[PDB]
Amino acid sequence: VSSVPTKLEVVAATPTSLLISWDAPAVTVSYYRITYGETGGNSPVQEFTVPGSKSTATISGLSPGVDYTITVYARSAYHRRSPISINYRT
Amino acid sequence: VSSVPTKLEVVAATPTSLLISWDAPAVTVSYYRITYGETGGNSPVQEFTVPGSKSTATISGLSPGVDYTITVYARSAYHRRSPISINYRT
Amino acid sequence: VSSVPTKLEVVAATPTSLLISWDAPAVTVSYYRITYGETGGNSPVQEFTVPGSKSTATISGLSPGVDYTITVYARSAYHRRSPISINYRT
Amino acid sequence: VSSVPTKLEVVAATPTSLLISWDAPAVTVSYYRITYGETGGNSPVQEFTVPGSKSTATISGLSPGVDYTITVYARSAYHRRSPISINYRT
Amino acid sequence: VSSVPTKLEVVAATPTSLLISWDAPAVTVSYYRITYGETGGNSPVQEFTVPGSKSTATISGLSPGVDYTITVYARSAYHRRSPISINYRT
Amino acid sequence: EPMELTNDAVIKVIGVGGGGGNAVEHMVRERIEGVEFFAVNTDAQALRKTAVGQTIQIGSGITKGLGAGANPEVGRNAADEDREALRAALDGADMVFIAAGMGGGTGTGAAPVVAEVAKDLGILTVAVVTKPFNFEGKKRMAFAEQGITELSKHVDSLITIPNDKLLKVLGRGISLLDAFGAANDVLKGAVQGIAELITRPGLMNVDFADVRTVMSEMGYAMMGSGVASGEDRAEEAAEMAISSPLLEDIDLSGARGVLVNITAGFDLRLDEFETVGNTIRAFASDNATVVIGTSLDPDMNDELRVTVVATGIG
Amino acid sequence: EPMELTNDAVIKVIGVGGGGGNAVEHMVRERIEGVEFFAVNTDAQALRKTAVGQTIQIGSGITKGLGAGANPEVGRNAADEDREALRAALDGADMVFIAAGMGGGTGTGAAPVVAEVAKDLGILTVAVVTKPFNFEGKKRMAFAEQGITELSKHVDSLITIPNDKLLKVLGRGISLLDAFGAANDVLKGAVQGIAELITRPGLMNVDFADVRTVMSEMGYAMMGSGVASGEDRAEEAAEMAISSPLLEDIDLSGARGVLVNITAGFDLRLDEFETVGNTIRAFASDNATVVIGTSLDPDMNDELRVTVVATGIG
Ligand SMILES: Nc1nc2c(ncn2[C@@H]2O[C@H](COP(=O)(O)OP(=O)(O)O)[C@@H](O)[C@H]2O)c(=O)[nH]1
Ligand SMILES: Nc1nc2c(ncn2[C@@H]2O[C@H](COP(=O)(O)OP(=O)(O)O)[C@@H](O)[C@H]2O)c(=O)[nH]1
């Protein structure tokens, strides 16, 4: 895969939210940087960080019927691996 | 029901009067506002208030053979619930 | 049968009463809940309970020529079986 | 961008007015010079200045259905950067 | 055959289970590795091991009407023979 | 950004927990005007049953959608891990109402986190929370007290409505469904009394700035209301509002700010406005900030409702 | 995986053996809500007759589908060789009920293996097993005691319901079909009383975390229930639940946790909730974890059912 995290799952927890899940890392991650926004949209993406002990993240305020692109960065003191990106159409 | 009062009964006490009965409320009502008039009539309705400890109201001066619409408002300091309306044909 | 009680008998003790009989239960019943009312009638049913040591119940104030539906609930600490219902036309 | 201000937003506050918004500057601006007029029109543009602590400007007396060009100059004692221009069609 | 085990039989013990049978080996097998999953499915296969003295294996949690592929590995200290695979459509 | 200066006031009501979700669903059914409704709960099934339109499931990685139980710490941790969803829902609002029932796990622990997020977003945050009845035990009451103390640190105003005060006006032999329906009605009444000064004002109106003057960095608040009809409607309604059981815990002369909402039809009179104001200012303190506005109910005739919110009690 | 955090609680009931299969088939017929049912048996013909929907035949290579006999060791070996099917069926559940009749071969020997698999899967495992009547001999009773001792090592809670306690309430001259129907009803009542706090809660509810608080790593448990109607329904039902013959073997003041389910209609009152809680907490110990919730039965009028589960008896 060469990108940390290697697996990415998205589930619609509510009709206006998304639940995001990734696999546990082999090396300790300090925090995860998640950048979500409309796919191919001119508006800037929204960004937030969760601590590295977590494995799930919830994003709200999502307009139904609009495509979204979600990217997760795993920031560790021991690597600089690529992020993983997923596309979800609400 | 979502409207206070939930039950409404009308009985012709005399050939020219009506007796109006409603169920007791779960929350204290300060007064009841009763608005009666001809159903689908251009004339303004007649209005009066009885104290909230009461459960019956008598309306007089009713022309026989004429439809009437009666609405009861339960005015309390603890809710703003909808009124209940009934139709009686004398 | 799957419903306790399994058998239900109704007899007109007087021209304005009904005698209701059910079989003895295999498991101790604390009390029986009997709900009687006009069959397919908008008026609420009348309800009362007899102790579980009894096997008969008398209901009065019945208008002749009017259908009645009688349901018996056997309330025990050891089951939650369905009730049994009968129709009697006075 | 190389032009101060870098961002420019226009919103129709009323059917005959426009609200103009720009981003905050990195360096203190003494005043903003706004020049508005019909796009590609022979008539001279209208000009006014707002203090540099402001971030919004309202222009009135705008004929509906007529294109307008709005230019904002950021005048500071510490730079001579280019202005930014926008086109709005009422 | 060149693959151990040489024979493989599958029977639906229950509408949601499968019974798997293979022939006895000529050489002692320490354990059998069974890998079952949907035929041509992207989901990873499920794996478990039974001791080599056994000759049958039951797999549960099978969705009816879905094809399954079952592979059995005979792991012995005295050979490295190929596995045998079967297809069953529930 | 330019449109955010040329739009109507955005008011959001978020119900936290099961009781808060039920109250907000009641407000949705009863149609408060010009308000957007949200429900926030750890229990996914309860959220799926709540008919509020927009729901947020917090703590999905700590409670697995199965609820936080009766532990306020679990609710706090559930809200702490989904501050992004709370921020995304809250963003874009001028006033936020946080309705909750103190005593449980989700509401008690998660209302302070939503309040903290809302305040850090620069939003006028009003917490309308209840306390449990004495019939609910001492553990629920202790949890409620702790949650209220925690919540008071992250709100502009905190309106406390003890359910024990509702027992004085509840019918004898009343089921708890009807008692909690009454509590829902009281919470909706507080939210409506504060928000309808803005959403449906009368001819004598106040703006959002006037409301923010008495509802900002005030602390504890209490609410009382009254109704009356006939010729003496104004004085009777005002005196009944001052003498509300939901206000008897405090003294109106110690409040640092009083907000008064007069709801009436098209027949309110100038002397009635003056006498309601005079009664309130007579029973208040001399240096308290008093804001008095009117709201409009087209279906009120010859009758007058007065709602009083006393802020800065301390 | 993300969907496993945003779904309703998954409750599975597995009947092991002939008696367990009959009890679970009774539960299927009587329609417990929000529960999935399984039957596990060595006898293939009995499994083919059980109408539970999803069945698992264990020991197919040891018993050939002809049953394990009256030997608990054969049942244990039958379950030991099909741990994969048990794991596949159990996987994906939050709570599992293992219903069995101790004394035979399949149930007595195979319930501990299913319990071990369920616990190793990290599932809340509740074993609801009976003991045989004294009419069944001493060998069945010794097998049942051994199986219960073995089963207590792999469960979170183990509810023991002695059939001899049912003789006190069974009609005189009763056939064994009706006696075992009563036993089926008691097992279904235990499962329903624990599960309907989650599946169909009332307005005063508890979540799966609250249940897990008193049902996890507790050990032996006992269950009692009571019903009542009229004005004194709450006190009568609570006292009848405490004085159940299925609870008389223990002292409620020694339990390390009490779970109380109040089933009622839409007319439960706050003082009734308070008095049931007060009775339970008065007859319990001071440091016991007491969890009290309500369930909803729309067909109950003026009546009230109370179920008490006492855990951690030791
Ligand atoms: N207004 C109202 N209050 C409630 C309702 N249900 C419970 N409450 C109160 O809210 C408090 C917290 O309970 P609840 O919200 O259900 O627990 P939580 O969901 O875990 O936070 C309780 O002490 C009750 O007094 C309801 O339907 N309406
Ligand atoms: N509740 C219930 N218990 C039963 C039934 N049949 C047998 N039992 C009890 O279960 C115990 C075990 O018998 P059984 O389950 O038939 O043997 P197994 O199938 O080999 O495990 C016996 O001692 C009986 O007391 C039944 O239909 N319902």
Author numbering:
A (entry chain B), B (entry chain B), C (entry chain B), D (entry chain B), E (entry chain B): 1 to 90
F (entry chain A), G (entry chain A): 3 to 316
Copied sentences from the primary study:
FtsZ is a tubulin homolog GTPase protein that is widely conserved in bacteria and plays a key role in a complex called divisome, which carries out cell division. FtsZ polymerizes into protofilaments to form the Z-ring that acts as a scaffold for accessory proteins during cell division.
Surprisingly, the addition of the Mb stabilized the thick helical tube of KpFtsZ and enabled the structure determination by cryoEM at 2.67 Å resolution. After refining the helical parameters of the KpFtsZ–Mb tube, the reconstituted 3D map revealed a strand of parallel double-helical protofilaments forming the tube with a diameter of 250 Å, with a helical rise of 7.70 Å and a helical twist of –23.40°. C2 symmetry along the tube axis was imposed to improve the resolution and quality of the 3D map as the two parallel KpFtsZ protofilaments formed the double helix. The Mb molecules were located between the two protofilaments and somewhat inside the tube. Residues 4–8 formed a short 310 helix stabilized by the N-terminal cap of Pro4, which was located in a hydrophobic pocket formed by Glu9, Val11, Leu19, and Ser21 of the Mb of the adjacent protofilament. We found GDP in the binding pocket instead of GMPPNP, indicating that added GMPPNP did not replace GDP that was kept bound in KpFtsZ during the purification from E. coli cells. On the other hand, the Mb contributed to lateral hydrophilic interactions between the adjacent protofilaments. To evaluate the curvature of the FtsZ protofilaments, we superimposed the four models of KpFtsZ trimers generated from the two crystal structures and the two cryoEM structures with the bottom molecule (mol A) and found that the protofilament in the cryoEM double-helical tube showed the largest curvature among them.
